[PDB]
Amino acid sequence: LSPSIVISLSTGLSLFLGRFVFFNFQRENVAKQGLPEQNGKTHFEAGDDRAKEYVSLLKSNDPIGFNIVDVLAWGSIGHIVAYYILATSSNGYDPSFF
Amino acid sequence: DISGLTPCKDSKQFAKREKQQIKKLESSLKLYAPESAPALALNAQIEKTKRRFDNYGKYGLLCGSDGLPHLIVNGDQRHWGEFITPGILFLYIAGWIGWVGRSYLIAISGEKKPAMKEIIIDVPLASRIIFRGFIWPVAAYREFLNGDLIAKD
Amino acid sequence: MRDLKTYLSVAPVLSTLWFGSLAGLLIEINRLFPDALTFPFF
Amino acid sequence: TFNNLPSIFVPLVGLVFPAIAMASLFLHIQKNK
Amino acid sequence: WLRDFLWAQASQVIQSYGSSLSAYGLFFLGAHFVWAFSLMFLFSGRGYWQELIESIVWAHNKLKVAPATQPRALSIIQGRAVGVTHYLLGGIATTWAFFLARIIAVG
Amino acid sequence: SHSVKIYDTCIGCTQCVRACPTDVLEMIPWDGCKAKQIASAPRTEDCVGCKRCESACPTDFLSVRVYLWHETTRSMGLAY
Amino acid sequence: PPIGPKRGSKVKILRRESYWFKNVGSVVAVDQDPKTRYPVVVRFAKVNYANISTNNYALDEVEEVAA
Amino acid sequence: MALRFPRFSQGLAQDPTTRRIWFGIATAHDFESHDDITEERLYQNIFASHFGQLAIIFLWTSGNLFHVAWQGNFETWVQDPLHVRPIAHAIWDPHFGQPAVEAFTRGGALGPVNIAYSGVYQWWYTIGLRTNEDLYTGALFLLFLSALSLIGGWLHLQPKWKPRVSWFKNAESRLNHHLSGLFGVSSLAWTGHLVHVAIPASRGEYVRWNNFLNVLPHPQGLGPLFTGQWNLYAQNPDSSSHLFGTSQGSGTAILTLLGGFHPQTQSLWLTDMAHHHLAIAILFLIAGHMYRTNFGIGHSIKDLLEAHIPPGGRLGRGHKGLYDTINNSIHFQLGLALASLGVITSLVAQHMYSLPAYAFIAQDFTTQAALYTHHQYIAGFIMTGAFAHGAIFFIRDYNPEQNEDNVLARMLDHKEAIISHLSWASLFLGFHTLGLYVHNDVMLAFGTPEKQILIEPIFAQWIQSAHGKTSYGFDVLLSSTSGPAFNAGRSIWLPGWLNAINENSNSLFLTIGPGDFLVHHAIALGLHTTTLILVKGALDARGSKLMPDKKDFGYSFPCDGPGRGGTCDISAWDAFYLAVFWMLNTIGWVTFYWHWKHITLWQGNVSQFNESSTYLMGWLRDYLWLNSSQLINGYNPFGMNSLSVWAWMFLFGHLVWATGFMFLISWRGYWQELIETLAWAHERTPLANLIRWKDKPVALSIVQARLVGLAHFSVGYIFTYAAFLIASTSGKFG
Amino acid sequence: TKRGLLLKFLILGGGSLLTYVSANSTGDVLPIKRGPQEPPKLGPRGKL
Ligand code: CLA
Ligand code: CLA
Ligand code: CLA
Ligand code: CLA
Ligand code: CLA
Ligand SMILES: CC1=C(/C=C/C(C)=C/C=C/C(C)=C/C=C/C=C(C)/C=C/C=C(C)/C=C/C2=C(C)CCCC2(C)C)C(C)(C)CCC1
Ligand SMILES: CC1=C(C/C=C(\C)CCC[C@H](C)CCC[C@H](C)CCCC(C)C)C(=O)c2ccccc2C1=O
Ligand SMILES: CC1=C(C/C=C(\C)CCC[C@H](C)CCC[C@H](C)CCCC(C)C)C(=O)c2ccccc2C1=O
C-alpha cells in the first residue's frame, strides 16, 4: 500500500465515521457540555470580547450539519492514524513475545 | 541467597568480623591476670561473641559485602523470623497495651470526675482490666463487628 | 496502709514501678537471650 | 581597556548604585504628599 | 575554632566507638539531638500544637479512648521552659561528651 | 486603629471592661441576657491590642473580639 | 409554657464556633424571657481551652439528644 | 491611594513606626489585599508582574551567557571538556590580597575567576553553542527578549490593551494554547534545534543561522517524514565509538530511540532527546485540542468536573462546583501550579543525575551535586509554597456555600482524620527510623556491628531488578530474558538501557543497601511531617476548636492572645513557617544522602557508605567531619587555597543560621522594652537630640520576626550546605 | 548649600572619583589589578 493510499483511506474512513457514525454522539456531547461557563455566564457573556463562538466558520451547509471544524477534527484523526499506520509498518520491529 | 546476599555462616566477611572482634577482646585480655575477675568477664564476653556469631550463622541471617546480618522483611518464609514472627509478637503485645488502656478508659469513663482516675490509677480495676487484653484480638474483632470499637458521636 | 496505696496508685509512682519491673524483665531476658536478631522458636 | 571594565562597574554597582538607591528610597520612604 | 578546635579535638569522640569512650561518642550525638529537639519548642508556639492535639483527640474520640485529663499543648511559658531546658541539656551534654572523650583519649 | 467588635453572645459579666487597661470597652444597657447589659467599644482608637478583654470573656469561644488592624502610636504602646 | 429543654434534659450542640460542637451537654437552666437571645445554659463534662465548662446557647444552636 | 511609601496600603502609610517600612516591603506583591483593588486590576498587575519576572529570567540568562562569553574559558572547555575547568565569571574584589589572586586564578585565565558549578558549560556545549561569539549572540537575543517582556508588561498595563477579568478566566483557551503551543510547539521547536543544530554540532559541522537553510539534517530530507518511512531517521545511530564534537564515529540518524548513555560523555544521545521532544510535542499538540475555545468542539472543564460525581456518593457531590473555586481563585491556581512545579522540579533533580542529558556533566562531580541540591531545595520550597497558597485559598478565596458537600468541602469535613493519620505516619516513621538508627549507633558504639538492624530494601531492589539491574538475582521482567518486557523492547532500547544500568560507575539506579532503606524512611518521615504541618495549617486555616474565627484574621496574623491557654503560632502562616524548618530538614536529609552516596561512588569506596550509612555517627564522622577537612582548611594561618571562599561562606551560613535563632527563640516584648531604653538614650544624649527619627523605632513585629528568623535560618542552611557540598566535591573531585 | 544640587553633586562626584581612582590604580595599591603573578596550578583530577 502506497502512503498516499494509506493517508487517503484512513482520512476517508475517519471523516466517514465523523459524518455518519460518530456525529450524533459528538454533537449531543457538545450540546451537553455546551460552552465553558465562567461563573454561570459563558466566557463571552462575562466579557473578554474575544471568546465568541465563531459562526461564520460553523454555518456551512450540510443536511446533517457537518462543518469545517469537524472536517479538521475528523481528518486530523485521519492523518494521525494514517501516519501511525505508516510509521508502525515502515519500522521493522519484532515484538518477539514468542 | 535473596537480594544478592550470601548467608552469614558462609560469608567470609562475617567470620572476619568475628575474628576481628575476638582479637580486639583478646588484646584487652592480655593486660589482666588469667584468673582475675576482669579477665573472666572478658572471657565470658568472648564466648558470648562466639556464640552470637554462631547463632547468626544458624538462624539463616544473610550477610552482605560489608559482612553484617541483613534482614529480609519482604515476606519470604525463610526470613519470617526476622520481621513477621517478631512483628506479630509486637502487634499482639502492643495491642494488649492499647486494648487494656482503652478498656480501662471505658471502665472509668462513667465516673463523676473521671480525671482523678487517670492520674491515680485504680490498681484493682487496672489489674482486672490488664488480663482482659490477653486474648485481645478476638475482643477487638468482635467489637469491630458489633460497632463498639468506634464511637458514634 | 491507707492513702499510701493511693499515692502508689498515682501515675508517676505507678509508672516507675511498672517500668522498673518491665525494664528488669527486659534486662534479664537480654541476659538470658543476649544478642538477639531473629525469632527462631517459631 | 576591557580588563579595566570590572574596576569601573563593580564600584558603580556595589558602591555608587547602592548609595543612589538607598538615598532615593529613603527619600521615597519619608515623602508626604 | 571550627577547624583546629571543634573539628580537630572532636576526632576522639568519633573514634570513641569501640573503646570505653563509646558512651561519650553516643552522648555526643544524643546531646546533639536533644539540643535540636529543644528547637521544636523555642521556635514554635502553643497554638499549632493545641490544634494538632485536637485533631489527635478527634482520632481518640473515634475509638472510645478519649482521656479524661484533657490533652492540652504546653503552656507558652512551659514551651519556653522545655525549650531552654532541652537546649542547655543538649548543648552542655554535647560539650561534656566532647571534652571528656577528647581529654580521656589524649591526656 | 484596631477593631474591637463584640457579639451578642455576651452575658454582661463586666470582666472584659474590668480587664481593659485602656478604657476601650464600657458596659451599656441591653436586653439580650440575664444581666441586661452588654459591653460596647467606643474608644477603639485607644486599643493597644493586648486581648485581656478576650482572655477574660467566659463564653463558649468569645463575645468580645479584637481584630488587629492599622497600628497607630496609641496602638503600638509607645510612650515616645 | 416553659420554653426550650428542661433543667436536667440532655442536649447536644449545633453551634459551629463552640468548643463542644457535636458534643453533648446538660441543660442547667433556660431563661424564659423571650428577649434573651441565648437562654439555654448548658453544662459540659469537659472544660474548654478557657477552663470553662458552661455557656449559654440558643434554642436553634442546640438539639435535644435522644439518649 | 495613600500618602507615605506603602501607597498600596493606607494602613501602613498611616503607621508612625518603622513597621511601615518593613510591612510595605513585605506586602508589596500581595495585590489581593491592597486598597481600591478590583479583580480586574489584580489580574492585570499579576500579568504585568509575570512579564517582569520573564524579563528578569531572560536578563539573568543573558548575564550568564555574557560572563561566560567575556570572562569564561568556554572556547578552551569545548576542546578537552572533562579535564578543563569551567569558569562562571571573573572576579574584581578590591579587598583581595595577592595570595587570594594567586589562588583564585583557575582554568587558564588571565586573572582570578570562579568555577562554573552550574553546568551551563555542559548544557550549552550539548545544544551547539561552540564559540564564544555564539554565547554573545545568545546574550544579545535574551537581552532582546528581556526588553520584549518589559514592553509587553508595560503595554498590557495601558488602557488600550489592559486585558479584562474574563480574559484571564478563560481557562479552556489558555490550556488549549499552552498545551498545544507553549508545551507542544516549544518541544517541537526544540526538536528542530536538536536536529538542525545540536546533532550536527555533536557530529562535527557547525550549522548556524547563516547556513542552516542549505544543509540537510538528514541526507534525504522530509521524504521519510512525509512518506511515513520514519525508520529512515533511525539508520546510523553513531554506535558506541562516537567522539562528541567530532565526526569520528558519527552517524546520520536524528531520532533513533536507543536508550542508555553515550559511551564517551556518559550522557543521553542527542538523537534520543530529539525523538523525545518530538514525541511529547505530538502528545502535547494532541492534548491541546481538547478544551473548547471558539469552534464548537472540545470539552468544557465545567461539565467535566460537574459530570464526575460518582453514584453512591462515596465522594459526596464530587467536583460539582470546582471550576468556579479555581477559575475565580488565583490562590488555588497558584497552589496547584506550585504543586506540579515542585513535583516536576524534584523529578528534574532525580532524573538529571541518573539520566544526565548534557555532555560531560556526569564527569564533573561538583556540578551534579550543585544541580541536584539546587533543584531539590527549590522543589521543597515550591512545595511548601503550593501548600501555603492552598491555605491562603482556604482563607481568602474559599466559598463553602458555593461548593457544599463537593470533593473539596469534604476535606474540611474530615480534616481531623487526614491530620491524625499524617500524624500517625510521620510518628511511626520517626519512632522506627530513629529507633533503628540509634540501635545501630549503639551497636557500633558497643563494638557489635553484627547486631545492627540492617533491613534490606527488597522492594526497591526488586524494582531495580524490574529494570534490568542484574545485581540482586531476582530475575524480574527486565532482568529476566524470558519475559514479555524483555521481548517487546529487546530490539529498541533495552540494549542500551541494560548496558547503562548494569554499569556500576554511573548514577543510573545505584546499588542500594540497608543504609538506603533507613535514609529513605528518614526521607519519608520528612515528607510526611512537612505534609502534616502544611495540610494541618491549610485545613485549620479557616478555623479550629481553639480559634474557629481564624478566617476573619487572615492568613498571617501573630496569635490570638494568651487566653484560652495560649495561641502562639496558631495561624496557617505559622504552620507554613514551621513546615519550612521541617522542609529544610527533609531536603537536607535527601541531599546528604545523595551527596554521600555519590561522593563515595565517585571516590570508589561504595563500601564506605554501605557500612557507614546505617548509624548516625557514620554520617557525622565519615561524611560531615571527613569531607569538611579540605573545606575548613580553605584558609589556615599558614596560607589559603581556592576553597577559601567556601570556608568563608560556610562560616557565614553558620552565622546567619544562628542569627535566625535570635528571632525564633528570642521573641518580641524584650526588644520593644530594649528599644524604649535606646530611644530614651537618643533623646537624652547630647549632640544627638539634634538628630531625631521620622519613623518611630519599634521592634520587629511577631509574624515578621518569625519570617526574619526563618529567612536567616534558611539563608544559612542553604549557604552552609552549598559551601560544604561544593568545597568537598571540588577539593578532590571524586 | 543647595540640597538638590548637593545630593546630585555628591552622587555624580563620588561615583566619578571612585570609578576613576579604581581605574587608574596601578598594581601597587591593590593586588586585584596586578594579576596572578604566579604560574597557575592545575586542579584536582588533572584539572577537573
Ligand atoms: C524501634 C527500633 C528498634 C528495634 C526494632 C530494635 C530491636 C532490637 N534491639 Mg534495639 N535499640 C533501640 C531501638 C530498636 N531496637 C534503641 C532506641 C536503643 C537505645 C535505647 C536500642 C538499644 C539496643 C541494645 C543495646 C540492644 C538492643 C537489642 C535489640 C533486639 C532485642 C532483643 C530482645 O531482648 O528482645 C527479646 C524479646 C523481648 C524482650 C520481648 C519479651 C516480651 C514478653 C516476655 C512477652 C512475650 C510473651 C507473650 C506472653 C506472648 C506469648 C504468646 C502466647 C503464648 C500468649 C532487637 C533486634 C539487643 C540485641 O540483642 O541486639 C540485637 C541489645 O543488646 N537494642
Ligand atoms: C569584607 C568582606 C567582603 C566584601 C565587602 C567583598 C566585596 C565583594 N566581593 Mg567578596 N570575598 C570576600 C570578602 C568580601 N568581598 C572573602 C573573604 C572572599 C573569599 C576569598 C571573597 C570572595 C569573593 C568572590 C569569589 C567573588 C567576590 C566578589 C565580590 C564583589 C561583588 C560585586 C558586587 O558588588 O556585586 C553586587 C552585589 C550583590 C548582587 C550582592 C548583594 C546582594 C544583596 C545583599 C541582596 C539584595 C537585597 C535587595 C534586593 C537590595 C537592597 C539594596 C538596594 C538599596 C540596592 C564585591 C566587591 C565577586 C566579584 O568581584 O565579582 C564581580 C566574586 O566573584 N568575593
Ligand atoms: C500558543 C500560544 C500561547 C503561548 C505560547 C503562551 C505562552 C505563555 N503564556 Mg499564555 N495565553 C495564551 C496563549 C499562549 N500563551 C492565550 C490564548 C491566553 C488567553 C486565554 C493566555 C493567557 C495567559 C496568561 C493570563 C498568562 C500567560 C502566560 C504565559 C507565559 C508563561 C510563563 C512561562 O514562561 O512559562 C514557561 C513554561 C514552560 C515552557 C513549560 C515548561 C515545563 C516543562 C515540563 C519543564 C521541563 C523541561 C524544561 C523546559 C527543560 C529546561 C532545560 C533548559 C532549557 C533550562 C508564556 C510566555 C503567563 C505569563 O508569564 O505572562 C507573561 C500569564 O500570566 N498566558
Ligand atoms: C531533633 C529535633 C526534632 C525532632 C526529634 C522532632 C520530632 C518531631 N517533630 Mg519536629 N520540629 C523540629 C525539630 C524536631 N522535631 C524543629 C526544629 C521544628 C521547627 C519549630 C519542628 C517543627 C515541627 C512541627 C511543626 C511538627 C513537628 C512534628 C514532629 C513529630 C513528628 C513525628 C515523628 O517523627 O515522631 C516520632 C517521634 C520522635 C522523632 C521523637 C523522638 C524521641 C524518642 C523517640 C522518644 C523516647 C525518648 C526517651 C525514651 C524518653 C526518655 C527521656 C526522659 C523522660 C528522661 C516529632 C515529635 C509534627 C508532629 O508533632 O506531629 C506528629 C508537627 O506537626 N515538628
Ligand atoms: C560590594 C562593593 C564594594 C566595593 C567595590 C568596595 C571597594 C573597596 N573597599 Mg569595601 N566594603 C564593602 C563593599 C565594597 N567595597 C562592604 C559591603 C563593606 C562592609 C563589610 C566593606 C568594608 C570595607 C572596609 C572595612 C574597607 C574597604 C575598603 C575598600 C577599598 C579597597 C582597599 C584598597 O586596596 O584600596 C585602597 C584605597 C584607598 C585607601 C582609597 C579609597 C578611595 C575612596 C574609596 C574614594 C572615594 C570615593 C567617593 C568620594 C566616596 C564614595 C561615593 C559613594 C557615592 C559611593 C575599595 C575602594 C578598604 C578601604 O580603602 O577603606 C576605605 C577598607 O578599609 N571596604
Ligand atoms: C493545601 C491545598 C492545596 C495545595 C495542595 C498541595 C500542594 C498538594 C500537593 C500534592 C502533590 C505534590 C501531589 C503529588 C502526587 C503524586 C502522585 C499521585 C503520583 C502518582 C504516580 C503514579 C500513578 C505513577 C505511575 C507510574 C509509575 C509508578 C512509574 C512509571 C510510570 C507509571 C505511570 C506506570 C490546593 C491548592 C490543591 C487546594 C487547597 C488545599
Ligand atoms: C512539641 C511541642 C508541644 C507538644 C508537646 C507535648 C504536648 C508535651 C509532651 C507530653 C508527653 C509526650 C505526654 C506523655 C507522657 C504521659 C505522662 C504519658 C506516659 C504514658 C506512656 C507514654 C509512657 C507544645 O505543646 C508546645 C507549646 C508551646 C511552644 C512549643 C511547643 C512544642 O514544641
Ligand atoms: C534581634 C531582634 C530584634 C531587634 C531587631 C531590630 C529592631 C531590627 C534590625 C536592626 C537593623 C535595622 C538591622 C537591619 C539589617 C539588614 C541590613 C536589613 C535588611 C533589609 C533590607 C533588605 C531592606 C527584634 O525587634 C525582634 C522582635 C520580635 C521577635 C524577635 C526579635 C529579635 O530577635
Ligand code: SF4
Ligand atoms: S468579658 Fe465577654 S461576656 Fe463579659 S462583659 Fe465583656 S464581652 Fe460580655
